[PDB]
Amino acid sequence: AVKIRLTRLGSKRNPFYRIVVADARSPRDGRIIEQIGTYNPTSANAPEIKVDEALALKWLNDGAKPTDTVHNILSKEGIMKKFDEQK
Amino acid sequence: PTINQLVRKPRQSKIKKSDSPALNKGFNSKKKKFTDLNSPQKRGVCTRVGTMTPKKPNSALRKYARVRLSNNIEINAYIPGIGHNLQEHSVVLVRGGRVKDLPGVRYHIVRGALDTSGVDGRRQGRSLYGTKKPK
Amino acid sequence: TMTDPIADMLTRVRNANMVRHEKLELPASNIKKEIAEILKSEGFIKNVEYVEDDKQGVLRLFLKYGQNDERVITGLKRISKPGLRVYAKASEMPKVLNGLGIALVSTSEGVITDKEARKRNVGGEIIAYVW
Amino acid sequence: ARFRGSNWKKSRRLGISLSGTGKELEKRPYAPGQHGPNQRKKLSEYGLQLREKQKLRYLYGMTERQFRNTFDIAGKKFGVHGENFMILLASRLDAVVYSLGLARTRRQARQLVNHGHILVDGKRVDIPSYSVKPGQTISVREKSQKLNIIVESVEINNFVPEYLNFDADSLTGTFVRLPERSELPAEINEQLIVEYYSR
Amino acid sequence: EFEERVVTINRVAKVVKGGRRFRFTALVVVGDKNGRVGFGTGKAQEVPEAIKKAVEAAKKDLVVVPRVEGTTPHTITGRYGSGSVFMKPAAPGTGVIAGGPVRAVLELAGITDILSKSLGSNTPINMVRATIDGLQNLKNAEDVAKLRGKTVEELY
Amino acid sequence: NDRKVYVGKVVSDKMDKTITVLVETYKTHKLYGKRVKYSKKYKTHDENNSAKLGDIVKIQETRPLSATKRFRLVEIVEES
RNA sequence: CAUUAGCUAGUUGGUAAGGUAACGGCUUACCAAGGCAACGAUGCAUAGCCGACCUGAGAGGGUGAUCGGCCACACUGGAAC
RNA sequence: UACCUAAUCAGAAAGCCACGGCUAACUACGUGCCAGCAGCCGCGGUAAUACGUAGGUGGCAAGCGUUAUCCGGAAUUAUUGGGCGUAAAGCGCGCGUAGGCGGUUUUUUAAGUCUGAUGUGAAAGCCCACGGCUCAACCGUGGAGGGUCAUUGGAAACUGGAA
């Protein structure tokens, strides 16, 4: 179904990722629905992550299901926490 | 013309007829059909090796070769350089470029290529005319 | 037959200016009246006289020449023609001779020049080039 | 070093002294070659445009398609195209090192940058074409601070251009200012290379 | 001092009973690189003397070229016969983007930044005449404001 | 939402419950810029065929009716 | 491309019925003769389309490799589960 | 495996094309309208800077030339931006249909025209700025730009519609 996942945007051995809401059947670097934020795992020390809040909580309420590491990224901003608070 | 005449009859530019037509055509042996390819070079078989008299202002015996290319096309090609080892049934590589004097020769045989030796005594200009670096 | 009365007006000015006639007359029109008064305010011609006859009154134009009989008007060019009309936005208003000449533009604010037309930020029909 | 050739024959074919400040055009100020000693013919427009381009290219030791690439970057910047082009050449790391006074010429300064004796901003920058920005620090590698060649030229350099603050102690530079047309080489007509590339 | 540039040297002929009396004609443009340029031609029996006549011919008639910071005040197209030269003023750092005989004429005047194109015959003499024609039709802001009874600021 | 509306002229009423409406509009030339008149014929439905050849009528689109018609007759304003 | 001028007969409209996720000649009967076309019907040849790429001062001209969106195809041709 | 640190060696690391004018670079020898060169102008017929070679020169350089195809130069389809007396071009001449264009004033409308506001013109691309790879290529961010676009106000001189 609808998945919040990462799209590779990096060169050889220098990956950059966008946090994107996309259909599961779509290709990894192909068709998408919405861009949510970015994820850079090769920055200085801590991997710098950028996430929007309004759209991210909008898609989660609509049934979008984060992958294993988008869950981590949404947790480091407390997004999964505030999603849990609104039961 | 007037603008209305231009609207009804838009301007028509002239078509460009390209030299070396036999390099622009391919062949399909399965369908027995001619195609469009735009090849840099074509490979053929020498069906006749001889010498041609040049145009009237000039006077020199020029070597040439009747080449049937990969297509079913029979063209005449120049042989640059001094000495050549080509007789009948010699596979050659033919590029573009015509000879001004020779009427009916619109191509050049590439020296130093498949079954075509270079110029024996060439020492400056070895990229053209074939032949490797002496010593 | 007559198709562009305005192009006739500019050609009348062009032909009279070439032989340095001091004055000319042409059948008047509201738009041809405004063009004359634009050229007066911009300093291309000396005076505009509009005479009331019964039918299509007469527009008398007094041309201006300089010290050494230097024709003040150098050229006239109709831009918008009946066979092909020209309209311009306020952003792409042309600069005749880098501002050394005026372009007559008919906008919603009346027949005006190209300089202050960019001031009102309005566009219209590019009537003619005067330099 | 790309050229690696005779720096006199180039300055003899050209009209400027390139590197050496006069030592090359003293006994034979004419062109090199068999026909050098005899009289020189006149130069056409193209010959003069090409000559001036070769003057500035061989002065900095750069090759074409990198001289041209740098020229392309210059046109992007605001101002005169010719001025920003020569400013950018004066901002090259290999040229800044020589103009700082660390080496005694252009080619040697290149081998100092190339072999990694510079450590721009404290970090090894071994690219001769690095573009130095105002407000940087061109130091010398600690293990290379006891180089006889470096210290042989640190005192004979004397004049340092105003857009470069040079410290004789600690072997450091600053690049305080953007060079103006005045500080740039005055033997080069910038307007003649701009016209060459527009041809 | 007026710097001179030889534009072209042409060997002409007059057929006589003996045959082909050959002469030489020289086209020379003179200028001062300050806004005074002129052209002239002269025919002699030898090349070096045809230049001197052309130089003297050119120094007589000089055209004052108005200019603002080495560029023309505005855009103009000079015409003479089949020759036509379009001339667009350019930015301070542009340079002289001109062709053949047009390039010499503008360089010998105080023009250093222009965009131009020869929209006509490439015959050198008519190219020069066309180039000069545009330079005399040129108008500066001061004259235009004076002619229209307005201030320079009122024009803009 | 809103379905598009066109105003044209009746050029054919030889079929029952169907008329042909000629909606003439203007299209400028891409290169030369002159506006050229071009016309498009629309086949419209009218259960009570009160439209007669020569009437200017009001046309609004709808779901596909028959192989060609996609429009219905909204308003008839001329008499001719 | 006009040295391709007249093209169609479910064709074009209507009335019923059927069946389609759904409107609809989509199909079938019966009515009427209709419908498109020099604003290029039809026919022939060529071609995947686009974002985009090359060139040019611009207007334009050429192109549709790699990357992304859409389409179509899976030895050739039919069919359904 | 990047990468860094120690020793060691100038040692293992340049060729291609041009040099008659366009078009930067000229001499000598061999040949003698031959052999050959050539994109065009053209060269070569015992004293070729045009052929082959040798020196020198010049242009680039891990590349250099040739060929194939596109745009430019070509204003040589001219909308920007061409013409038709003699260079190519006014139909042999009327009557006329579609179409194209159309005299002056007033009122109205608002299709064109102009000026806003929304929605969209995906992303990646071009340009600008900024940041990260030692620089650059490259990468990533932020703008910009891109439509005969759709909806909806406002203006009414011009073109269009009505009186």
Short mmCIF file of all heavy atoms in Angstrom, two decimals, chain H residues 120-139:
data_model
loop_
_atom_site.label_atom_id
_atom_site.label_comp_id
_atom_site.label_asym_id
_atom_site.label_seq_id
_atom_site.Cartn_x
_atom_site.Cartn_y
_atom_site.Cartn_z
P U H 120 -1.50 23.83 -6.73
OP1 U H 120 -1.29 22.69 -5.79
OP2 U H 120 -0.80 25.11 -6.49
"O5'" U H 120 -1.13 23.32 -8.19
"C5'" U H 120 -1.78 22.19 -8.75
"C4'" U H 120 -1.66 22.18 -10.26
"O4'" U H 120 -2.29 23.36 -10.81
"C3'" U H 120 -0.25 22.22 -10.82
"O3'" U H 120 0.38 20.95 -10.82
"C2'" U H 120 -0.47 22.78 -12.21
"O2'" U H 120 -0.96 21.77 -13.09
"C1'" U H 120 -1.59 23.78 -11.96
N1 U H 120 -1.08 25.16 -11.74
C2 U H 120 -0.58 25.83 -12.84
O2 U H 120 -0.54 25.33 -13.95
N3 U H 120 -0.12 27.10 -12.59
C4 U H 120 -0.11 27.76 -11.38
O4 U H 120 0.33 28.90 -11.31
C5 U H 120 -0.65 27.00 -10.29
C6 U H 120 -1.10 25.76 -10.51
P G H 121 1.98 20.85 -10.87
OP1 G H 121 2.33 19.41 -10.83
OP2 G H 121 2.54 21.77 -9.85
"O5'" G H 121 2.37 21.42 -12.31
"C5'" G H 121 2.05 20.69 -13.49
"C4'" G H 121 2.50 21.41 -14.74
"O4'" G H 121 1.80 22.67 -14.87
"C3'" G H 121 3.96 21.81 -14.80
"O3'" G H 121 4.82 20.73 -15.13
"C2'" G H 121 3.96 22.93 -15.83
"O2'" G H 121 3.88 22.40 -17.14
"C1'" G H 121 2.63 23.62 -15.51
N9 G H 121 2.81 24.78 -14.63
C8 G H 121 2.55 24.87 -13.28
N7 G H 121 2.83 26.04 -12.78
C5 G H 121 3.29 26.78 -13.86
C6 G H 121 3.74 28.12 -13.93
O6 G H 121 3.82 28.96 -13.03
N1 G H 121 4.13 28.46 -15.23
C2 G H 121 4.09 27.62 -16.31
N2 G H 121 4.50 28.14 -17.48
N3 G H 121 3.67 26.37 -16.25
C4 G H 121 3.29 26.01 -15.01
P A H 122 6.27 20.62 -14.45
OP1 A H 122 6.58 21.92 -13.82
OP2 A H 122 7.21 20.03 -15.44
"O5'" A H 122 6.06 19.55 -13.28
"C5'" A H 122 5.28 19.85 -12.14
"C4'" A H 122 5.45 18.80 -11.08
"O4'" A H 122 4.97 17.52 -11.58
"C3'" A H 122 6.89 18.52 -10.67
"O3'" A H 122 7.36 19.43 -9.69
"C2'" A H 122 6.83 17.08 -10.19
"O2'" A H 122 6.30 17.00 -8.88
"C1'" A H 122 5.82 16.48 -11.17
N9 A H 122 6.47 15.92 -12.37
C8 A H 122 6.35 16.38 -13.65
N7 A H 122 7.04 15.70 -14.53
C5 A H 122 7.64 14.71 -13.78
C6 A H 122 8.50 13.65 -14.13
N6 A H 122 8.92 13.42 -15.37
N1 A H 122 8.93 12.84 -13.14
C2 A H 122 8.52 13.08 -11.89
N3 A H 122 7.71 14.04 -11.44
C4 A H 122 7.30 14.83 -12.44
P A H 123 8.78 20.16 -9.87
OP1 A H 123 8.90 21.19 -8.81
OP2 A H 123 8.94 20.54 -11.29
"O5'" A H 123 9.83 19.01 -9.54
"C5'" A H 123 9.74 18.27 -8.33
"C4'" A H 123 10.44 16.94 -8.44
"O4'" A H 123 9.74 16.08 -9.38
"C3'" A H 123 11.86 16.98 -8.96
"O3'" A H 123 12.81 17.38 -7.99
"C2'" A H 123 12.05 15.56 -9.47
"O2'" A H 123 12.26 14.66 -8.39
"C1'" A H 123 10.68 15.28 -10.08
N9 A H 123 10.65 15.65 -11.50
C8 A H 123 9.97 16.69 -12.10
N7 A H 123 10.16 16.77 -13.39
C5 A H 123 11.03 15.73 -13.67
C6 A H 123 11.62 15.27 -14.87
N6 A H 123 11.42 15.84 -16.06
N1 A H 123 12.43 14.20 -14.79
C2 A H 123 12.63 13.63 -13.61
N3 A H 123 12.14 13.96 -12.42
C4 A H 123 11.34 15.03 -12.52
P A H 124 13.89 18.52 -8.34
OP1 A H 124 14.63 18.86 -7.11
OP2 A H 124 13.20 19.59 -9.10
"O5'" A H 124 14.90 17.78 -9.33
"C5'" A H 124 15.53 16.57 -8.93
"C4'" A H 124 15.96 15.74 -10.11
"O4'" A H 124 14.80 15.38 -10.92
"C3'" A H 124 16.90 16.40 -11.10
"O3'" A H 124 18.25 16.44 -10.65
"C2'" A H 124 16.68 15.57 -12.36
"O2'" A H 124 17.35 14.33 -12.26
"C1'" A H 124 15.17 15.33 -12.29
N9 A H 124 14.45 16.41 -13.00
C8 A H 124 13.57 17.33 -12.49
N7 A H 124 13.13 18.19 -13.37
C5 A H 124 13.77 17.82 -14.54
C6 A H 124 13.74 18.34 -15.85
N6 A H 124 13.00 19.39 -16.21
N1 A H 124 14.50 17.74 -16.78
C2 A H 124 15.24 16.68 -16.43
N3 A H 124 15.36 16.11 -15.24
C4 A H 124 14.59 16.73 -14.33
P G H 125 19.12 17.77 -10.83
OP1 G H 125 20.39 17.61 -10.07
OP2 G H 125 18.26 18.95 -10.56
"O5'" G H 125 19.47 17.79 -12.38
"C5'" G H 125 19.40 18.99 -13.13
"C4'" G H 125 19.17 18.73 -14.60
"O4'" G H 125 17.76 18.44 -14.84
"C3'" G H 125 19.48 19.90 -15.51
"O3'" G H 125 20.86 19.99 -15.84
"C2'" G H 125 18.57 19.64 -16.71
"O2'" G H 125 19.12 18.62 -17.53
"C1'" G H 125 17.33 19.09 -16.02
N9 G H 125 16.40 20.16 -15.60
C8 G H 125 15.73 20.17 -14.41
N7 G H 125 14.99 21.22 -14.22
C5 G H 125 15.18 21.97 -15.37
C6 G H 125 14.64 23.23 -15.72
O6 G H 125 13.86 23.94 -15.08
N1 G H 125 15.10 23.66 -16.96
C2 G H 125 15.96 22.96 -17.77
N2 G H 125 16.29 23.53 -18.93
N3 G H 125 16.48 21.78 -17.44
C4 G H 125 16.06 21.34 -16.24
P C H 126 21.76 21.18 -15.25
OP1 C H 126 23.18 20.87 -15.54
OP2 C H 126 21.35 21.44 -13.85
"O5'" C H 126 21.34 22.44 -16.13
"C5'" C H 126 21.45 22.41 -17.54
"C4'" C H 126 20.95 23.69 -18.16
"O4'" C H 126 19.50 23.75 -18.10
"C3'" C H 126 21.41 24.98 -17.49
"O3'" C H 126 22.72 25.36 -17.86
"C2'" C H 126 20.34 25.97 -17.91
"O2'" C H 126 20.56 26.42 -19.24
"C1'" C H 126 19.08 25.09 -17.91
N1 C H 126 18.34 25.17 -16.63
C2 C H 126 17.85 26.39 -16.12
O2 C H 126 18.06 27.46 -16.72
N3 C H 126 17.17 26.39 -14.95
C4 C H 126 16.95 25.26 -14.29
N4 C H 126 16.28 25.31 -13.13
C5 C H 126 17.43 24.02 -14.78
C6 C H 126 18.10 24.03 -15.93
P C H 127 23.72 25.98 -16.78
OP1 C H 127 24.98 26.35 -17.48
OP2 C H 127 23.78 25.06 -15.61
"O5'" C H 127 23.01 27.33 -16.31
"C5'" C H 127 23.00 28.48 -17.15
"C4'" C H 127 22.35 29.65 -16.46
"O4'" C H 127 20.96 29.35 -16.20
"C3'" C H 127 22.92 30.02 -15.10
"O3'" C H 127 24.07 30.84 -15.20
"C2'" C H 127 21.74 30.71 -14.42
"O2'" C H 127 21.63 32.05 -14.85
"C1'" C H 127 20.56 29.92 -14.98
N1 C H 127 20.09 28.84 -14.08
C2 C H 127 19.45 29.12 -12.87
O2 C H 127 19.31 30.30 -12.51
N3 C H 127 19.02 28.09 -12.10
C4 C H 127 19.19 26.83 -12.51
N4 C H 127 18.75 25.85 -11.72
C5 C H 127 19.84 26.52 -13.73
C6 C H 127 20.25 27.55 -14.48
P C H 128 25.11 30.94 -13.98
OP1 C H 128 26.13 31.95 -14.35
OP2 C H 128 25.53 29.57 -13.61
"O5'" C H 128 24.26 31.54 -12.77
"C5'" C H 128 23.94 32.92 -12.72
"C4'" C H 128 23.23 33.28 -11.44
"O4'" C H 128 21.95 32.60 -11.37
"C3'" C H 128 23.94 32.86 -10.16
"O3'" C H 128 24.97 33.75 -9.78
"C2'" C H 128 22.79 32.78 -9.16
"O2'" C H 128 22.44 34.08 -8.70
"C1'" C H 128 21.66 32.26 -10.03
N1 C H 128 21.50 30.79 -9.94
C2 C H 128 20.86 30.25 -8.82
O2 C H 128 20.47 31.03 -7.95
N3 C H 128 20.70 28.91 -8.74
C4 C H 128 21.14 28.12 -9.71
N4 C H 128 20.96 26.80 -9.59
C5 C H 128 21.80 28.64 -10.86
C6 C H 128 21.94 29.97 -10.94
P A H 129 26.24 33.20 -8.96
OP1 A H 129 27.22 34.30 -8.85
OP2 A H 129 26.65 31.91 -9.56
"O5'" A H 129 25.66 32.90 -7.51
"C5'" A H 129 25.11 33.95 -6.72
"C4'" A H 129 24.45 33.41 -5.47
"O4'" A H 129 23.30 32.61 -5.82
"C3'" A H 129 25.30 32.47 -4.63
"O3'" A H 129 26.19 33.17 -3.78
"C2'" A H 129 24.26 31.65 -3.87
"O2'" A H 129 23.78 32.37 -2.75
"C1'" A H 129 23.13 31.56 -4.90
N9 A H 129 23.08 30.28 -5.63
C8 A H 129 23.52 30.03 -6.90
N7 A H 129 23.30 28.80 -7.31
C5 A H 129 22.67 28.20 -6.23
C6 A H 129 22.18 26.90 -6.02
N6 A H 129 22.26 25.92 -6.93
N1 A H 129 21.60 26.62 -4.83
C2 A H 129 21.53 27.59 -3.92
N3 A H 129 21.95 28.85 -4.00
C4 A H 129 22.52 29.10 -5.19
P C H 130 27.56 32.49 -3.29
OP1 C H 130 28.31 33.51 -2.51
OP2 C H 130 28.20 31.83 -4.45
"O5'" C H 130 27.08 31.36 -2.27
"C5'" C H 130 26.47 31.70 -1.04
"C4'" C H 130 25.82 30.50 -0.40
"O4'" C H 130 24.80 29.96 -1.28
"C3'" C H 130 26.73 29.31 -0.13
"O3'" C H 130 27.52 29.46 1.04
"C2'" C H 130 25.75 28.15 -0.08
"O2'" C H 130 25.07 28.13 1.17
"C1'" C H 130 24.76 28.55 -1.16
N1 C H 130 25.10 27.95 -2.48
C2 C H 130 24.64 26.66 -2.75
O2 C H 130 23.97 26.06 -1.90
N3 C H 130 24.94 26.09 -3.94
C4 C H 130 25.67 26.76 -4.84
N4 C H 130 25.94 26.16 -6.00
C5 C H 130 26.15 28.07 -4.59
C6 C H 130 25.84 28.62 -3.40
P G H 131 29.01 28.88 1.08
OP1 G H 131 29.73 29.52 2.21
OP2 G H 131 29.58 28.97 -0.29
"O5'" G H 131 28.81 27.34 1.43
"C5'" G H 131 28.29 26.94 2.69
"C4'" G H 131 27.90 25.49 2.68
"O4'" G H 131 26.89 25.26 1.67
"C3'" G H 131 29.01 24.51 2.33
"O3'" G H 131 29.84 24.20 3.44
"C2'" G H 131 28.24 23.30 1.80
"O2'" G H 131 27.74 22.52 2.87
"C1'" G H 131 27.05 23.97 1.11
N9 G H 131 27.22 24.10 -0.35
C8 G H 131 27.42 25.23 -1.10
N7 G H 131 27.50 24.99 -2.38
C5 G H 131 27.32 23.61 -2.49
C6 G H 131 27.31 22.76 -3.62
O6 G H 131 27.45 23.07 -4.81
N1 G H 131 27.11 21.43 -3.25
C2 G H 131 26.94 20.99 -1.97
N2 G H 131 26.75 19.67 -1.79
N3 G H 131 26.95 21.77 -0.91
C4 G H 131 27.15 23.06 -1.24
P G H 132 31.31 23.59 3.21
OP1 G H 132 31.97 23.49 4.53
OP2 G H 132 31.96 24.36 2.11
"O5'" G H 132 31.04 22.11 2.68
"C5'" G H 132 30.48 21.12 3.53
"C4'" G H 132 30.42 19.78 2.84
"O4'" G H 132 29.53 19.86 1.70
"C3'" G H 132 31.73 19.28 2.26
"O3'" G H 132 32.53 18.64 3.24
"C2'" G H 132 31.28 18.35 1.14
"O2'" G H 132 30.95 17.07 1.64
"C1'" G H 132 29.99 19.03 0.66
N9 G H 132 30.15 19.84 -0.56
C8 G H 132 30.30 21.21 -0.62
N7 G H 132 30.38 21.66 -1.84
C5 G H 132 30.28 20.53 -2.63
C6 G H 132 30.31 20.40 -4.04
O6 G H 132 30.43 21.30 -4.88
N1 G H 132 30.16 19.07 -4.44
C2 G H 132 30.02 18.01 -3.58
N2 G H 132 29.90 16.80 -4.14
N3 G H 132 29.99 18.12 -2.27
C4 G H 132 30.13 19.40 -1.86
P C H 133 34.13 18.69 3.13
OP1 C H 133 34.68 17.51 3.83
OP2 C H 133 34.56 20.06 3.53
"O5'" C H 133 34.40 18.53 1.57
"C5'" C H 133 35.43 17.68 1.10
"C4'" C H 133 34.88 16.48 0.37
"O4'" C H 133 33.76 16.87 -0.46
"C3'" C H 133 35.84 15.80 -0.59
"O3'" C H 133 36.71 14.90 0.07
"C2'" C H 133 34.90 15.12 -1.58
"O2'" C H 133 34.44 13.87 -1.07
"C1'" C H 133 33.72 16.09 -1.63
N1 C H 133 33.75 17.00 -2.81
C2 C H 133 33.61 16.49 -4.11
O2 C H 133 33.50 15.27 -4.30
N3 C H 133 33.63 17.36 -5.15
C4 C H 133 33.75 18.67 -4.94
N4 C H 133 33.75 19.47 -6.01
C5 C H 133 33.87 19.21 -3.63
C6 C H 133 33.86 18.35 -2.61
P U H 134 38.29 14.89 -0.23
OP1 U H 134 38.51 14.17 -1.51
OP2 U H 134 38.98 14.44 1.00
"O5'" U H 134 38.65 16.43 -0.45
"C5'" U H 134 38.88 17.29 0.65
"C4'" U H 134 39.80 18.43 0.28
"O4'" U H 134 41.15 17.93 0.13
"C3'" U H 134 39.50 19.11 -1.05
"O3'" U H 134 38.48 20.08 -0.95
"C2'" U H 134 40.86 19.69 -1.44
"O2'" U H 134 41.10 20.91 -0.77
"C1'" U H 134 41.82 18.63 -0.89
N1 U H 134 42.25 17.66 -1.92
C2 U H 134 43.34 17.99 -2.70
O2 U H 134 43.94 19.04 -2.58
N3 U H 134 43.70 17.05 -3.63
C4 U H 134 43.09 15.83 -3.86
O4 U H 134 43.53 15.09 -4.74
C5 U H 134 41.97 15.56 -3.01
C6 U H 134 41.60 16.46 -2.10
P C H 135 37.22 20.06 -1.95
OP1 C H 135 36.14 20.88 -1.35
OP2 C H 135 36.95 18.65 -2.32
"O5'" C H 135 37.75 20.82 -3.25
"C5'" C H 135 38.06 22.20 -3.20
"C4'" C H 135 38.58 22.68 -4.53
"O4'" C H 135 39.79 21.96 -4.88
"C3'" C H 135 37.66 22.47 -5.72
"O3'" C H 135 36.68 23.49 -5.83
"C2'" C H 135 38.62 22.43 -6.91
"O2'" C H 135 38.94 23.75 -7.34
"C1'" C H 135 39.87 21.81 -6.28
N1 C H 135 40.07 20.38 -6.61
C2 C H 135 40.32 19.98 -7.93
O2 C H 135 40.35 20.82 -8.84
N3 C H 135 40.52 18.67 -8.20
C4 C H 135 40.48 17.77 -7.22
N4 C H 135 40.68 16.49 -7.55
C5 C H 135 40.24 18.14 -5.87
C6 C H 135 40.05 19.44 -5.62
P A H 136 35.17 23.14 -6.26
OP1 A H 136 34.39 24.40 -6.27
OP2 A H 136 34.71 21.99 -5.44
"O5'" A H 136 35.30 22.65 -7.77
"C5'" A H 136 35.78 23.52 -8.79
"C4'" A H 136 36.09 22.74 -10.05
"O4'" A H 136 37.21 21.86 -9.80
"C3'" A H 136 34.98 21.83 -10.53
"O3'" A H 136 34.04 22.51 -11.34
"C2'" A H 136 35.73 20.73 -11.27
"O2'" A H 136 36.04 21.13 -12.60
"C1'" A H 136 37.03 20.64 -10.48
N9 A H 136 37.04 19.55 -9.48
C8 A H 136 36.87 19.67 -8.12
N7 A H 136 36.97 18.54 -7.47
C5 A H 136 37.23 17.61 -8.46
C6 A H 136 37.44 16.22 -8.41
N6 A H 136 37.42 15.50 -7.28
N1 A H 136 37.69 15.58 -9.57
C2 A H 136 37.71 16.30 -10.70
N3 A H 136 37.53 17.61 -10.87
C4 A H 136 37.29 18.21 -9.70
P A H 137 32.47 22.20 -11.23
OP1 A H 137 31.74 23.24 -11.99
OP2 A H 137 32.15 21.99 -9.79
"O5'" A H 137 32.30 20.82 -12.00
"C5'" A H 137 32.63 20.72 -13.38
"C4'" A H 137 32.89 19.30 -13.80
"O4'" A H 137 34.03 18.77 -13.08
"C3'" A H 137 31.78 18.30 -13.52
"O3'" A H 137 30.74 18.34 -14.48
"C2'" A H 137 32.53 16.98 -13.49
"O2'" A H 137 32.82 16.53 -14.81
"C1'" A H 137 33.85 17.39 -12.83
N9 A H 137 33.81 17.19 -11.37
C8 A H 137 33.56 18.13 -10.40
N7 A H 137 33.58 17.65 -9.18
C5 A H 137 33.87 16.31 -9.35
C6 A H 137 34.03 15.25 -8.44
N6 A H 137 33.92 15.39 -7.12
N1 A H 137 34.32 14.03 -8.94
C2 A H 137 34.43 13.89 -10.27
N3 A H 137 34.29 14.81 -11.23
C4 A H 137 34.01 16.01 -10.70
P C H 138 29.20 18.41 -14.01
OP1 C H 138 28.37 17.87 -15.11
OP2 C H 138 28.94 19.78 -13.49
"O5'" C H 138 29.12 17.40 -12.78
"C5'" C H 138 29.12 15.99 -13.00
"C4'" C H 138 29.16 15.24 -11.69
"O4'" C H 138 30.34 15.63 -10.94
"C3'" C H 138 28.01 15.52 -10.74
"O3'" C H 138 26.84 14.78 -11.05
"C2'" C H 138 28.61 15.18 -9.38
"O2'" C H 138 28.63 13.77 -9.19
"C1'" C H 138 30.04 15.66 -9.56
N1 C H 138 30.24 17.04 -9.06
C2 C H 138 30.28 17.30 -7.69
O2 C H 138 30.14 16.36 -6.90
N3 C H 138 30.48 18.58 -7.27
C4 C H 138 30.62 19.56 -8.15
N4 C H 138 30.81 20.80 -7.71
C5 C H 138 30.59 19.32 -9.55
C6 C H 138 30.40 18.06 -9.96
P C H 139 25.39 15.38 -10.72
OP1 C H 139 24.38 14.43 -11.26
OP2 C H 139 25.37 16.80 -11.14
"O5'" C H 139 25.31 15.33 -9.14
"C5'" C H 139 25.40 14.09 -8.45
"C4'" C H 139 25.53 14.30 -6.96
"O4'" C H 139 26.77 14.99 -6.66
"C3'" C H 139 24.46 15.17 -6.32
"O3'" C H 139 23.26 14.47 -6.09
"C2'" C H 139 25.15 15.67 -5.06
"O2'" C H 139 25.15 14.66 -4.06
"C1'" C H 139 26.59 15.85 -5.56
N1 C H 139 26.86 17.24 -5.98
C2 C H 139 27.04 18.21 -4.99
O2 C H 139 26.97 17.85 -3.81
N3 C H 139 27.29 19.49 -5.35
C4 C H 139 27.36 19.82 -6.64
N4 C H 139 27.60 21.09 -6.96
C5 C H 139 27.17 18.85 -7.67
C6 C H 139 26.93 17.59 -7.30
#
